[PDB]
């Protein structure tokens, strides 16, 4: 009696320690290349920011009015999103973005700042609602009379809760020094911000800039995080965008950037800007910057694991 092994006419080539191109009976893939060109959001609380920039949800330009108190397990940034209506920028913007992505949403709370002896309803043609408006969560602090002085004012807020609060203020950089003296009066203007982990103070830098959104003045957006039972102090005297409400982190989530469509039909934990990687394989060759619970990215496009024996045909 004889005894042997099986074989096939068309085998599958793999690589080993010894050879490169050994023909085996059956093989399987270890590097995922298939992509789902959608953000698989089945079972998750998704917030698609759209034209609203992430940081904008803290300041509140018009395009973010429907995102001032969101709650999510998955936060999607969009390329068309804008953080500002009046031309400005955020100092340490990417750090605050990475904070807000895994925050699980935000929760506003009024800080309770009352002002005696100044005006408090600044607006502009860019931040537009019914007419000329402004950032929802902010207040443009000006002087009473077209052209007066600004009284050296001091405000303060204590975090009365158990999680760190998010404090965001602004510094106005007017188009000229004559316009700065028009809005806030002449003389040097100093903005001091202090707490238990914070020093700092700031002052403006008026001058002409590029016309963005119609205006040439800018607004610096600064932020800190108040620890529980810690107080924050603002000693200002002009060119000040005061915070109305502070922000509190809801819980935990994950932030992604993508340009594909949301889909509640498929489930996924590994996301990139092109879609979702739905796979059980240990490796992937689609995006090295994929976030979530992903297979490890490798440079190789294919690595075949042998599931059968050596194929020796007649």
């Amino acid at each position: 009696i004889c005894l042997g092994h099986h074989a096939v006419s068309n085998g599958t080539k793999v690589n080993t320690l010894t050879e490169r191109g050994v023909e085996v009976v059956n093989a399987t893939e270890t590097v995922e290349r298939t992509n789902i060109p959608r953000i698989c959001s089945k079972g998750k609380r998704t917030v698609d920011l759209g034209q609203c920039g992430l940081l904008g949800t803290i300041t509140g330009p018009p395009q973010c009015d429907q995102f001032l108190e969101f709650s999510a397990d998955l936060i999607i940034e969009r390329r068309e999103g804008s953080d500002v209506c009046y031309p400005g920028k955020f100092v340490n913007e990417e750090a605050l973005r990475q904070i807000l992505r895994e925050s699980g949403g935000i929760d506003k709370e009024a800080m309770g700042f009352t002002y005696s002896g100044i005006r408090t309803n600044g607006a502009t043609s860019s931040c537009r609602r019914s007419g000329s408006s402004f950032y929802a969560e902010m207040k443009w602090l000006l002087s009473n009379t077209d052209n007066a002085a600004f009284p050296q004012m001091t405000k303060s807020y204590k975090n009365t809760r158990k999680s760190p609060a998010l404090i965001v203020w602004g510094i106005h950089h007017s188009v000229s020094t004559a316009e700065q003296t028009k809005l806030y009066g002449s003389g040097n203007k100093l903005v001091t911000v202090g707490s238990s982990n914070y020093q700092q103070s700031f002052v403006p830098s008026p001058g002409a800039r590029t016309q963005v959104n119609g205006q040439s003045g800018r607004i610096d957006f600064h932020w800190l995080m108040l620890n529980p039972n810690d107080t924050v102090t603002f000693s200002f005297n002009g060119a000040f965008i005061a915070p109305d409400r502070a922000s509190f982190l809801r819980g935990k989530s994950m932030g992604i950037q993508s340009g594909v469509q949301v889909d509640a039909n498929c489930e996924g934990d590994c996301y990139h800007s092109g879609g979702t990687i739905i796979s059980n394989l240990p490796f992937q060759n689609i995006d090295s910057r994929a976030v979530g619970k992903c297979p490890r990215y490798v440079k190789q496009r294919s690595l075949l694991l042998a599931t059968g024996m050596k194929n020796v045909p007649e």
Binding site: H6, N15, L305
Partner: protein
């Protein structure tokens, strides 16, 4: 898969099998124990390598608004290093696993052969290419007694010994 010079492409019944030709016709029937052993081992490899890491990685770059150049080049540097590491790990892992798989199948074939050899003690003799030359004409039911490991090691002994 060594000196068994080729495989039986018609054995679509299993991995290893017996093919005999005595006097009562032809025979080709697969063996279940060895085939199932190799299948369970390869299955173990597959179930171990297919794995979902519960480790979650967050964003660190920014695709829409590029971060500062220095920290960006440090980030890109680190990501490329880790990519090199995982590429190496994947390559070596796949190659090693393939080697152990092939040598595993060869080992199982050798075990089947050695067992069938020891099951018939002096009743048959070795030839050269994975067959057993019978020196007593063994009918089909006796071949089936060899297959399910019930062939007797002495009740056909001197009859084939004198030959």
């Amino acid at each position: 898969a060594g000196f068994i010079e080729n495989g039986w492409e018609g054995l679509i019944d299993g991995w290893y099998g017996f093919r005999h030709q005595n006097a009562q016709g032809e025979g080709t029937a697969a063996d279940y124990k060895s085939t199932q052993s190799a299948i369970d081992q390869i299955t173990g490899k597959l179930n171990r390598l297919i794995e979902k890491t519960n480790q979650q990685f967050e964003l660190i770059d920014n695709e829409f608004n590029e971060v500062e150049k220095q920290i960006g080049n440090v980030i890109n540097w680190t990501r490329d290093s880790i990519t090199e590491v995982w590429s190496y790990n994947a390559e070596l892992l796949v190659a090693m696993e393939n080697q152990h798989t092939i040598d595993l199948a060869d080992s199982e074939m050798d075990k089947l052969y050695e067992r069938v050899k020891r099951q018939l003690r002096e009743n048959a003799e070795e030839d050269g290419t994975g067959c057993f030359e019978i020196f007593h004409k063994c009918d089909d039911d006796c071949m089936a007694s060899i297959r399910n490991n019930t062939y007797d090691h002495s009740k056909y002994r001197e009859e084939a010994m004198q030959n």
